[PDB]
Structure formats: C-alpha cells, structure tokens
Amino acid sequence: LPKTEELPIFREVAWDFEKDEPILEKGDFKIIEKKEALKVWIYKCIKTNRYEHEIYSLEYGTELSELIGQKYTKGLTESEASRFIKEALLINPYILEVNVKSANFNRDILSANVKVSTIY
Amino acid sequence: VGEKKYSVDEFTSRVAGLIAGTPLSQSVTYTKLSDVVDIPKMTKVDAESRVNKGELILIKEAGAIRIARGVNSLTELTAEKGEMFQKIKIVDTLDIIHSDIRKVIIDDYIGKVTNSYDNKCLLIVAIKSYLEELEKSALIESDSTVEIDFEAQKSYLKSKGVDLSYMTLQEIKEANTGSKVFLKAKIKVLDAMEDIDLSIE
Amino acid sequence: PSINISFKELATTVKERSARGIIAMVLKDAKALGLNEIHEKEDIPVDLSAENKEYINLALMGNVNTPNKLLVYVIEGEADIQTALDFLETKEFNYLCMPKAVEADKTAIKNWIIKLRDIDKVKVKAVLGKVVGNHEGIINFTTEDVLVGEKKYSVDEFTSRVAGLIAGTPLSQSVTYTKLSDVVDIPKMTKVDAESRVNKGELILIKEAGAIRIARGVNSLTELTAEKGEMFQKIKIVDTLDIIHSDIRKVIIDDYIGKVTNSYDNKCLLIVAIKSYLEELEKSALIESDSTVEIDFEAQKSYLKSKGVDLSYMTLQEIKEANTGSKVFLKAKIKVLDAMEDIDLSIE
Amino acid sequence: VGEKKYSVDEFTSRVAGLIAGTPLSQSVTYTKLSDVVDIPKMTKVDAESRVNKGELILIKEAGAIRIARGVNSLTELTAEKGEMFQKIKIVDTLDIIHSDI
Amino acid sequence: MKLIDKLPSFDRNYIVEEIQGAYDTELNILKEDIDDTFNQLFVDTATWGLDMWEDILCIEKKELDFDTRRSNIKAKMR
Amino acid sequence: MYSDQTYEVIKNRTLENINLDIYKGEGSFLNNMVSGNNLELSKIYLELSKMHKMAFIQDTYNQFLDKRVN
Amino acid sequence: MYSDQTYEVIKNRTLENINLDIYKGEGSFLNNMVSGNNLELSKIYLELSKMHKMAFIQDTYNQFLDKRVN
C-alpha cells in the first residue's frame, strides 16, 4: 500500500577507474552524484571477491575468480559468468537490470559486453 | 612450504608432480597451494616483470598462494612459435598428439601395411578419426582437415623426372610414391583466457 | 602475469545540437570586469550591480521553460561594443541583449549580426530596443513606459526579459499572445494603434483575454522581399531555418571536410545522412514531412563547362558519376510548417 | 602552442609528424589543433592569398585553430600540371604507387 | 597493519593507508590500556590501585612503595 | 552486555553516529574503516568478557590460582 | 589509564595523527566519522572504568562484592 521513496543520491570519493586511486579536489573529497557513485560501487563489487575478506558482508562480492585461469570451456563459462555477474550486481537496489550480450574468445583474452539499467 | 624450509629443486619437483596431476582441460595458472603457508614478500610489479621474463613464480592472491602464469621457460619465442607456443599447456597437447600418431603409425603401417592409394585413403580415414577423438576433447578446435601432400608428390615426381604435364592432377595422387607417404593436416589447439576484460553500458 | 578487467558504460547521444537556448548579455560595470557563464539558477557574483542583478533575474524565468543557457560578460562602458563583439565571435550565442544599448551601439550590433549572417553564415539573432533596421535577425520591441510588477522598467530591461522568455519558448509552441503574469500595469493604448504598430513590423504588448500579452510574433524586418515574404516575416520560421543550417554545417565540419574522400558512393552516403537528419526534423512538427534531396545536376554541368569537357555523347548519369574535383553539388527540398494565430471559419 | 612560443621549424616538425600520423583516407585540410593556444590575427583575404601562393598556414575556424590547406609548396603549376598536383594528398598516393612498382 | 591486510586490492594506496594506520596506532594504545587495567585487576600487579585496595580493607594511611602496600594487605587479611 | 555488543550492532551504531551526506553503502572506504574498527572493538569486548571470569576467585588457571593462594 | 583519556582529547589526537594535505574542516563527514569512532571509543573507555569500579566495588553492589566477601 505505501508508495516507495526514491533513493537519495549516493555520494562518495572520486577516482579514475584505471587510476584506482581516489583523486582529491583541493584538499576536499570529490563529489559524485547521480550516475557516478553506482559505477564506483559496481567497480568495487566486481574487482574484489568478498569471500577473500571476512569484513565484507556475505551477499557482497563476486564469484568470477573461480572461472579465472581458463579452468573450463569458454562456451559454457560465458553463460555461467553471465549469471555470476547478474547475481553479483543485482544486490544493489539502485541497479535495475543486467544484460550480457556476448563474449570474445581470442588467445588468452576474453572480451564481453554487458548492460546496466538504472533509475537516474 | 608448511613452515618448512625448501630448496628450489624440492619445490620444482613438487610443481612437476602438481602438473602431472593437472587435467589438460583444466589450467595450471593461479593454482592455489594450501600446503604453502609462508612466503617472502615480493611486489606486484616485480611479479609482473618476472613473469614477463619467462619465469615461473609464486604470488599471494585471492586469499591464497598461487602462481601467476603458465608460460614456458622459453623466453624467446620465434615468429613460428609465438604466443600460443609461450604456453606449456599447448606444447603439451602438441607433444601428446605427435606421440600418439607416431605410436599408431609404428604399430600399424610401417612394413605391415602395403603402399597403395586405397591404403593411403584408409590411413587418412584413421588419422581423421583420431583427430575427431581429439576434437571430442576441448583441447583443440572441432574444425580440421587432412590432405595428401600434393606438393611433396610433385617434388617426388621431379626427383623421378616424370613430367608433370599431360596428365590430370588426380593421376599424381594415384601415382606410385615409391614406398613413401606425403600428407597434410590442419589443426588448431584451443587457446583461452586466464583473466578477462569486458565492456559495460 | 595478471591481466585485469576494466569496463566503462557508454550511452549513445541523441540529437546533438549547438547554439540552442543561449542568452548572451554584456553589462557595463567597473566592478566585475569579466565573463560569467550562468549554468545554475540564482548564480549571482557579488561584484554585479543591483540593476544587473535585476536584469539577470528577468533573464532567469521563461514563459514555458527556463532558458537553456545564459552567458554574461562584464567590462567597462568604454570600448564595450568592440570587446562584446570579440567575445561573441569567440563563443557562439543564440541571442543577444544589451542593458545600455545606445543607438550607435545598436546600429553597430545590427551591422555585426547581419555581416556574420551574410558572410560568416553565422545565423544569430539579436534583441534591440528601438531599431527600424532592414534585417530579420534583429528584434525591435517598441513598447515605451513598460511597468512590470508595479515597477518602472526601461525598454532594454523588458527586451532582455522578452529575449529570456523567447529562449524558454519551445519551437512547437508559439510566441504570440503570450500572457505575462508579472506585468500588472500597462499604459492605455488603443486597438487600432496596436494594429498599426504590428503592421509596422514592431513588437508590442496589449491587454487581451484578461491578461497582458503580445499581439504578433513577426520579425523586426519591416521590408520582406519577394524571396523572403510572409513566412520570413515570422521569427519562428527563421529560427528553425537557422537551427537546421547550423546543424548541417556542424555535422559536415565534423565528418566530411578532409576526413571523407570525394567519391560517388561517399556522396550517396552523405545524401543518406542528410536525408536521415531531415527525417529527424520531420519527426518534429517544425517542418513538413515531405522533402527530397538531390545532387545539384546544373552545378555539375557548370563544373564541366569550367573544365571544358563536352556534355554531349554520354549519359546524364555519367555526369553524376564524373569526378567533381574535390567539390560537392547538392539540392534539397524543404517546407517549414506555418500555422495560424487566430482563425476564421464558416457555418451553415 | 600550449601557452608557449614555438619556432617555425618546431611547428613544421609537429605538422610533419601529424601528417605521418595522417592516413591516406583523410586530408589534412581543416584539421583542428587542440595543443595550439593562439595564432597572430590576420585577414581571411590574406589567408586565401597565401593559399593561392601554396603556403600552408594555420587558421582559426569554428572557434579552433585549424589547417587552412593541404596544398603543396609548389607555387607555379604548368598548364598540364593540373589542380590535383597542387595537393600533397593526391601526389602522396602517386609517389607510393611509384615506389611500390 | 591488520586493517590494510583486510582492506581490498584497490585500497592499497597511501590515501587509504593513512587513516587505517592512525586507527591502528590508536587501537594499540587501547590494547596497552587493556593490559594496564588487567594488571590493575590483580592486587600484586596493581600499583596505584593498592590505595583503594586498602580502602576496601578500611585502613587508610600515606604509603611510600607498592611492595609495602602489598605486604600490609597480606598482613591485614588472615 | 558484551555478548549483545557485536561487530554488526556497533557498526550500525557508529554509522548512525555519523551525520554525513554520503549514503551508507557496502564496501565503502569510509565504511571500510568503520567496519575494521568495529571488528577490533568486538574482539576487545570478547576480551573484556573473558577477563570478567579470569578476575574471579573461581574458574582460575594454575597461575591464577597460584597468585590467589599466595 | 581509563579516566586519563577523555572523548575530546583523543578525538583531537586522532585528528592530529591524520597527516594529509586534506584540510581538517569542522563539520566534514571525515570529522563526523572521527566523532562517531571517538563516541564508541569513549563508550569502551567508560565501560573499562566501570569494570575497574566493579572490580573494586567501592559502590554499586555487585556479585563481585558477594564473591570477594566469600
């Protein structure tokens, strides 16, 4: 019966997702709003598996490291990792849906395409 | 390993034993070792450099102690060797297929089997069947072709001096090979990824 | 060794445009002396004067929407016109207004605007208080003794307010008969004089429909030539013509100059892209849905005559297939929607 | 360039490197220069005159400093030379074909 | 030193490290406070606490050295 | 008591103690410091619970009993 | 010493131990989290002081009183 309240804008420090070091503005932690904090949250969730660290909550983290190393066949592991990423990302209430398109199998490199739908 | 001092040779023997028990469809990279508990500290940049030197090392990753790469000790891979020959996983299956083909040929065809066009066709069929067996495994690609080495047949004719003109190229295959066999085959071993990198929208 | 994963989201841009909803105003103050781009509402530099703040507040609200962008530059009154011209040349502007425009400054502004529109092809519009100039790019709002919210207002103040109102006006909507709730007190002024003033090419305010609104949305251009005519009398049409011109110029500059080779198939792809952009415009109600684009065949013939190659003994299609010497000749058909302010029908 | 005075030869080297980085599909005409911050003010008529001379100069176009032309330094063109020979892009592929043959 | 070990891979830089190091130093201070208090729990290890030990004994006097405090406590009982 | 005090409970308490524009999120760097401090504080709570019993005359160890009887 | 350390002194000490070019601004979420962690710190120090009190039983009758009397 009650109508759900919109999630307030998430704020956090900012960094280049390649630098991986929080860039700081004139001695003040940078402001990220609307479509900036969710990307940082997704990056944090994907980069580190939770079960490696006891401090993090059990539902947090991703389980893609099991497939890391070429343990099984690429064709099946594509479908498996799609569901793995969907489970690892759908935990955030901000994220609406996850869509994975395909995977590129070449030498010792995998390239894939995934999609995210959000609220703002 | 296990709070015990180990010489380099001891752990190389341990790693060789680990490799022997490694299935081919599985991997050698990032294999965590529960027995190893204590390791000297060594920076990530140093690990990257050492791996890029063609070496095999141990790192503490994913809450465990594992290796970083499954490349060969060969530092200098030539143009014909390349990236797919940098990996021990691929040279292993190449060696296995080579040994199996040599063994079956020695068992069956040398001396016992006569040299004939139909004998060559049956040998090609058998080799194709063995390649299909390998294709059932995920080690190699499912697409492959086997052919008679036509250029080697031409070279044999030139050695014999028989003119290549005024007969069909099929007659060259039908021609006697002087107790010799010339063949050609296509292969492609599966090469896959350790870690990934994708794109999002 | 360890190779890592990095994925960054990407969303395709839709309808990238330029010089849209931009308000440029330069004020003479001895305190700020600089340019200030206004992106957030109620962004007031402390250096600005109270009257300048009132100008900004007038520019703030729009009729239907807040104006997309307002840009303010400050410099001393001396040599103000030259520096304003230089700054507006530096950065594109959709509209221009001057708090203290003298007649000579207004004339210089109109001359600069028409010079850009004719030589530089920079389609821009300016708002002027009392100018009878012979160009449609300028706007002449001749309503003296304007009082808004029981407050005295100069002509330039309300011209700036009207420009801000226009910036917030959607193109599918109208500028005519726009009631102003802020304006409460206006001098009495007869209907016949309103008709005469509108027919003079001027913009005025009238009290109609229980409110204070304008009477017409025509251009300041009093004399529309045969090629300009009634549809060019309206600012609403010149606005969309300028928008389409700027968009086509921008996309051509981005894509084809130098980067794209000159070929028949390249020309065909360019025609396809232009047709797609025209279809995008046709989706909007600004223009008609029927349009055609063609290669300028007569220009091809003229280029051949300049080259001296005889036009006889080949197919006319070969003329299109012929090389154009790193040049492109095209033709296109357009028809901008023109519609009615007030109506007149019949009954039985 | 980048808030710094540069010698003419410095920018000729920069442009030569840019052209070496330019594929044969594209043409160096109307190429924006982000690094360059300012150029001396000059009339567009003089720019067209220098284009007729064949000299290559920068130009401030669309609010950006850009290359006016890819015309060759060849000032005098005979009757049979043609306009295409005035273009470095056109003669470039001819030179490439000559070298390959 | 413990927190950074528990910290993720992307938080291995000094910007993250400073706060964790300061808090680890503070918690080292806290744990040595725990050690001191546990010493205070036992009468033998408690030095300054011997005064209200004697107060529990309901005997009060200015005292020189903690060894004599403990001796007087042992003499007082039984 | 200290059994009620756990890493999750004191973590939520500390999060409430902070009035900040940053919305509380799992895996946040700030949340990382808060969680680490809470974990160590819960360990310290357990130590306090233990020294409850260790300070008692009963349930002593050989050295504890030795000190008490001395 | 549990009573030696108080809320604001250790708050300022923790703020000083932070050695960054980031200016320490009052009312910042960083200052707010320092305040919350110091709140829990003051709680644990006060509870340690209460533990010492309960061990000596100078007031607040306890089971410790009964056992020591026994």
Residue numbers in the entry:
A (entry chain d): 16 to 135
B (entry chain a): 153 to 353
C (entry chain C): 6 to 353
D (entry chain P): 153 to 253
E (entry chain Y): 1 to 78
F (entry chain e), G (entry chain Z): 1 to 70
Paper excerpt:
Here, we report the atomic structures of an engineered diffocin, a contractile syringe-like molecular machine that kills the Gram-positive bacterium Clostridioides difficile. Specific attachment of baseplate tail fibers to receptors on the surface of a target bacterial cell triggers conformational changes of the neighboring baseplate, which leads to reorientation of sheath proteins and contraction of the entire sheath assembly.
Using the same strategy, we determined the cryoEM structures of the collar, trunk, and baseplate in the transitional and final states at 3.6–6.1 Å resolution. The baseplate wedges in the transitional and final states are almost identical, with both presenting a post-contraction conformation. By comparing them to the pre-contraction baseplate wedge, we observed repositioning of the dimerization domains of Tri2A and Tri2B, along with a twist of the trifurcation unit relative to the core bundle; the dimer interface between neighboring triplexes is, however, preserved. Although the conformational change in the diffocin baseplate wedge is less dramatic than in R-type pyocin, where the iris ring breaks apart after contraction, it is still sufficient to initiate the contraction and release the bound hydrolase domain of the hub-hydrolase. The observation that sheath layers on the baseplate side are fully contracted, while those on the collar side are partially contracted, supports the wave-like propagation model from the baseplate to the collar, and our structure of the diffocin in the transitional state provides atomic resolution details of a intermediate of potential relevance to other Gram-positive CISs. After contraction to the transitional state, the tube protrudes 45 nm away from the baseplate.
